[PDB]
Design a protein around this ligand. Structure first.
Ligand SMILES: Nc1ccc(CCc2ccc(C(=O)O)cc2)cc1
Lengths: 9, 273
């Protein structure tokens, strides 16, 4: 349910 | 001559790795990844033995290109008027660890242990070669699904390893240590260990622990998944607020949770095939 995202450098 | 030495194919990953294209070395049909970096966008420059000025990324890749399979290998590079072109190996079949964790959820600890161990060996290789990666995260780790071998990629935020303090940083903020958030200073090895604690939590919980600066510096780690007491202890130790309280790489690999690791081939046969 919780949002997982990428993180730019 | 690049266009003659390599058959150039389509963009890889729709730009998610950067300007990286599929390629084939005409010499021997070897599959390659062709990475383009614009000169106008290059942060740090380095020098080669020949005195040629190149992106630091090329300097660092050359230093770790010893053929140890835990880091991506730079096979060649070219200079163009406005850019540099990097020829990297292209293992297949692969999935990066970010997508792998997204699709699989929190990883079984036996699998996280194998992956974490291989990342530790790869980071040790980098440091032994004089290279600090500075952007360890699941997005920058490829899984060879047939061999069960992990590869550290994207040295574009890295630096030569030094023992004095770093005052610049261009990696991923949610993997960066609290001394960077608070003071814009860090030492290389203890900052690396912090990012490895974030990565290990990521593997056994299915996502990273902290999204905001206040969580990074707050010193509390809440476990959202069932995780063994030994793994929790290792994670919390890597995520010590004070850098000198964090373990060395030797202490990490001697930790009780790290013992009896699977071989890469065992990992592929049990968990990936
Ligand atoms: N089949 C397949 C698909 C994608 C890849 C990743 C290609 C790649 C490798 C290294 C870097 C880097 O170091 O920055 C960047 C990109 C490999 C194989």
């Amino acid at each position: 349910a919780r949002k997982r995202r990428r993180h730019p450098s | 001559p690049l266009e003659s030495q390599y058959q150039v194919g389509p963009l890889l990953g729709s730009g998610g790795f950067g300007s990286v294209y599929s390629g084939i070395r005409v010499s021997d049909n070897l599959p390659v990844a062709i990475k383009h970096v614009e000169k106008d966008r290059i942060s740090d420059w380095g020098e080669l033995p020949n005195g040629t000025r190149v992106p630091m990324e090329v300097v660092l890749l050359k230093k770790v290109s010893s053929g140890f399979s835990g880091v991506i290998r730079l096979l060649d590079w070219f200079e163009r008027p406005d850019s540099f072109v990097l020829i990297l190996e292209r293992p297949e079949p692969v999935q990066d660890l970010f997508d792998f964790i997204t699709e699989r959820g929190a990883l079984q600890e036996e699998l996280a242990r194998s992956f974490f161990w291989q990342v530790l060996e790869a980071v040790r290789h980098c440091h032994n070669c004089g290279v600090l990666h500075r952007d360890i995260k699941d997005e920058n780790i490829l899984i060879d699904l047939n061999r069960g071998e992990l590869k550290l990629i994207d040295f574009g935020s890295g630096a030569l390893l030094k023992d004095t303090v770093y005052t610049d940083f261009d990696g991923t903020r949610v993997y960066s240590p609290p001394e960077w958030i608070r003071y814009h200073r860090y030492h290389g090895r203890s900052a690396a260990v912090w990012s490895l604690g974030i990565l290990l939590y990521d593997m056994v919980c299915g996502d990273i622990p902290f999204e905001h600066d206040e969580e990074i510096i707050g010193g509390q780690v809440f476990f959202r998944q069932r995780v063994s007491s030994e793994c929790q202890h290792l994670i919390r130790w890597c995520l010590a607020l004070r850098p000198s309280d964090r373990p060395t790489f030797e202490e990490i690999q001697n930790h009780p949770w790290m013992q009896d690791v699977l071989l890469p081939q065992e990992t592929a046969e049990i968990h990936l095939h």
